[PDB]
Symmetry: D3
Subunit: 91 residues, 6 copies
């Protein structure tokens, strides 16, 4: 959409220079039509950005779940410590 | 986002009404609608920027945790010498 | 910039009041010019948000690449497990 | 057992000096009895060492199992990479 | 270990036989049995030492893996600057 | 030492042949002396194996202490998860 944004805006500026040269009701209306079409594209882009942000957060969420599991669980960790307590006793 | 989609719907309706019976009253009406739509675009953008800021700080915490996921070089240093010791007595 | 956004919008509202107070072709055109200038700044702010999102995704990509290497390589794991097997055989 | 070893051996050396002073069939037999009792204790100690070694290997085995799980599984890891491929595409 | 327990059983039997009807033939017999028991103690010890050597080398591999379990300081260095970058553009 | 073991045993076998060849009270006593000397070296070798086992257990103890800290502290994990929650709330 960033392409349509750049050009939807370039189109907009052309009409504006035009409008400022030969102001008329038709040119004003034409300029407003162009504005509306540019806002429609701004809205579309924003809707996409907000969607990208949502996916980013889901990826970040998965990253934390991974971090959550990187350690050694306290169930096996507890097993090894007792094993060591035992060995130290016998020894 | 909800407000955006509708302030854009409201904007498109005036535009065709303007294009139907154009008048100074309608042009001004349409401009007021544009301004209201732009103010809502601006709020959305500000929210997106706030979300980006919070996203970047979460990424920072993720990296802080990655830094600490390994085993300390102090503790790792003690074990190697322990190993060095053993391998000497043993031989 | 977020500031230039805030003010190209405040400027825009000022003209709109003027326009509604004393409507005229000159004021209408002036309001349209202000609109285009505000749209230009909306577009630039959007352009930067898209830039920032791409860098964020790149950073996320590095984070995952680091998570992939946090484990112990399966070449060392393979060697240790074999050692454990041999030991268990000799001791028994 | 290391205590009984040290003293079972000290006892042994006493008889030996004794034996070497007044050699006799009774002292020889007495010395052999002492030897046998010392070997019995050496065997007991060895049996314990071999048991300690067995427990050590079991602990080492658990340590490797832990190392085996410290990473992030290739099932979630695969999920995040696709999530990123998706994001990169849309974006 | 099996051989140990029995060369010790064999040794104890001669001892009581020696103590029953002591003779130079029996004393020499008992000494031969002792020597055979000691040779078997020595083999056991040598095996235990071999096991200790293999144990120590497994521990070395365990520590080598612990060293590599973290995230490289090179990769970790790249991400922080990435974060530094973002936080600058963003603000 | 493992070497002094090997040789106090070879020495021991030599006397035993002598003893069996020409038995005598002097040779018997001499064989017993050799035995005690071999037992003394068995005991020392055992004493070192017990020493080495204790250091091995100590090293194993450090390895487990390092495994306990390989995870990400639950204080950082707590903070990140909260951040994720807030973000999900603002974005929605």
């Amino acid at each position: 959409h960033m392409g349509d944004l750049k050009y939807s805006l370039e189109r907009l500026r052309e009409i504006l220079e035009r409008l400022e040269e030969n102001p008329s009701e038709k040119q004003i209306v034409e300029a407003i039509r162009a504005i509306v079409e540019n806002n429609a594209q701004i809205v579309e882009a924003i809707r996409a950005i907000v969607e990208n942000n949502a996916q980013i957060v889901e990826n970040n969420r998965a990253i934390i779940e991974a971090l959550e599991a990187i350690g050694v669980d306290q169930k096996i960790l507890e097993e090894m410590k007792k094993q060591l307590k035992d060995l130290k006793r016998s020894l």
